[PDB]
Amino acid sequence: MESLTLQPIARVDGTINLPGSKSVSNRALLLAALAHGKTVLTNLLDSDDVRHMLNALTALGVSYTLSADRTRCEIIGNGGPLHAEGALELFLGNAGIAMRSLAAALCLGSNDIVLTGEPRMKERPIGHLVDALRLGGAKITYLEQENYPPLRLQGGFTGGNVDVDGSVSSQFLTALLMTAPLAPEDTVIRIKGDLVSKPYIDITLNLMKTFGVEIENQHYQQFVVKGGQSYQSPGTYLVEGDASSASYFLAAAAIKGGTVKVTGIGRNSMQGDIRFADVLEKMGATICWGDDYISCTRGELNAIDMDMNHIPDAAMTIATAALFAKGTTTLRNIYNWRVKETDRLFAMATELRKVGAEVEEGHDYIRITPPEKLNFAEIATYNDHRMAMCFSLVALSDTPVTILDPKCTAKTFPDYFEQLARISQAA
Ligand SMILES: O=C(O)C1=C[C@@H](OP(=O)(O)O)[C@@H](O)[C@H](O)C1
Numbered sequence: 001m002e003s004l005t006l007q008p009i010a011r012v013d014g015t016i017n018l019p020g021s022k023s024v025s026n027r028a029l030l031l032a033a034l035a036h037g038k039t040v041l042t043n044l045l046d047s048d049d050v051r052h053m054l055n056a057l058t059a060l061g062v063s064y065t066l067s068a069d070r071t072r073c074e075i076i077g078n079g080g081p082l083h084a085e086g087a088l089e090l091f092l093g094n095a096g097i098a099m100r101s102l103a104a105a106l107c108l109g110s111n112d113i114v115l116t117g118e119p120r121m122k123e124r125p126i127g128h129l130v131d132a133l134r135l136g137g138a139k140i141t142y143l144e145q146e147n148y149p150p151l152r153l154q155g156g157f158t159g160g161n162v163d164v165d166g167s168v169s170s171q172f173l174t175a176l177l178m179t180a181p182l183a184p185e186d187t188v189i190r191i192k193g194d195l196v197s198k199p200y201i202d203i204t205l206n207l208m209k210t211f212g213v214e215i216e217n218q219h220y221q222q223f224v225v226k227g228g229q230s231y232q233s234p235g236t237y238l239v240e241g242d243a244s245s246a247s248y249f250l251a252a253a254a255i256k257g258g259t260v261k262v263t264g265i266g267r268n269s270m271q272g273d274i275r276f277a278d279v280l281e282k283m284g285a286t287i288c289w290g291d292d293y294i295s296c297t298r299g300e301l302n303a304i305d306m307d308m309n310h311i312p313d314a315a316m317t318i319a320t321a322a323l324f325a326k327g328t329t330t331l332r333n334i335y336n337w338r339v340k341e342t343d344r345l346f347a348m349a350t351e352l353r354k355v356g357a358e359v360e361e362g363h364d365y366i367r368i369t370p371p372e373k374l375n376f377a378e379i380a381t382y383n384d385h386r387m388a389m390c391f392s393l394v395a396l397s398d399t400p401v402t403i404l405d406p407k408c409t410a411k412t413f414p415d416y417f418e419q420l421a422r423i424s425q426a427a
């Protein structure tokens with residue numbers, strides 16, 4: 001199969017203008033599609049996950065145009081819930097936010113639509129969301145394994161009292177929050193217990209407000225939504241740079257800088273992953289905050305032991321950065337790594353051991369003890385963009401590393417390797 005071999009990188013230094021945020025991009029596209037008016041999105045991400053959402057919108061009859069580099073999109077709002085019949089199949093690759101958000105949104109009114117995706121997507125849980133949508137009146141059928149896509153949506157979500165489990169994915173709540181305002185009746189969403197990946201809920205509420213809708217958040221335990229609302233185009237909207245994609249570059253500087261500045265995100269960003277910079281600071285790196293940039297300058301790198309539930313994606317970057325840190329690093333409260341693009345706890349532990357680390361794969365945590373020196377390995381990437389990007393950091397040592405299926409980074413960052421190369425210096 002395909003592979004890419006990265007030669008040792010002596011130093012990293014420079015500036016990266018970040019690709020658009022995948023999380024903001026897919027929420028903005030869906031809200032723009034449901035809204036009244038024309039929305040112009042700029043700095044939109046061009047990647048597999050966004051392409052599947054754009055394809056779904058096209059299939060649902062939404063009109064839009066894209067610039068040559070696919071980062072500017074003019075969307076003609078539908079002025080209300082999207083609709084299609086005939087069990088129209090929407091293929092969503094392995095795009096979780098698209099699958100979860102559309103599963104809820106397409107429950108508005110009547111419809112007959114099937115959502116499916118790649119084999120791994122049929123193994124990613126969605127039962128907590130289906131349970132919630134059904135309490136609200138939706139008719140949903142599992143076409144294969146119970147609690148997983150593919151789903152056949154036949155509409156009927158009207159609102160009411162809806163409980164939702166937030167212990168496995170915040171995306172279920174996010175999906176409900178964006179959908180509920182357009183339901184005819186008022187909705188009270190009650191979180192059953194724990195809520196993971198909480199910062200993503202703030203991204204959702206931020207986007208909803210931009211598109212003209214606010215709800216009552218009662219300490220993230222219950223959300224009160226007024227039905228019969230409408231989303232409104234915000235005119236021109238600037239998609240923030242992706243803070244998760246930025247992690248690789250900031251970590252690279254913490255390990256082998258130099259100073260690396262990423263632009264497109266700053267101290268005012270709505271993304272929880274900018275908090276990744278805080279972790280690098282705690283490990284010993286120096287961080288600079290700007291209005292439209294965050295930079296990291298090499299200092300030292302010490303092992304840390306922390307709960308990473310607030311930055312599950314960027315946390316993977318700390319797992320490979322740990323190979324360069326003094327001491328044993330422990331990342332805790334990250335059980336849902338197991339239900340994402342791949343089981344990330346198993347995958348990360350397996351590949352880290354290949355370059356020499358001693359690793360304890362905990363049920364919901366990972367403990368990493370770096371080797372005195374890294375060795376060469378051919379890294380398996382599990383159709384997971386982040387395994388490829390995280391392990392690219394192994395090359396910031398004296399050993400090269402071979403990354404299998406490097407194009408898997410296209411899920412959220414097609415140009416990843418060229419960008420890492422841009423800040424890679426020989427001197
Ligand atoms: O809402 C979002 O944009 C996302 C929420 C997270 O998922 P979980 O809530 O399942 O942790 C994250 O891992 C994913 O990449 C994007």
Ligand SMILES: O=C(O)CNCP(=O)(O)O
Nearest residue numbers: 094095096097313340386
């Ligand atoms: O981007 C990541 O690291 C994980 N994504 C999970 P999603 O497919 O967006 O639900």
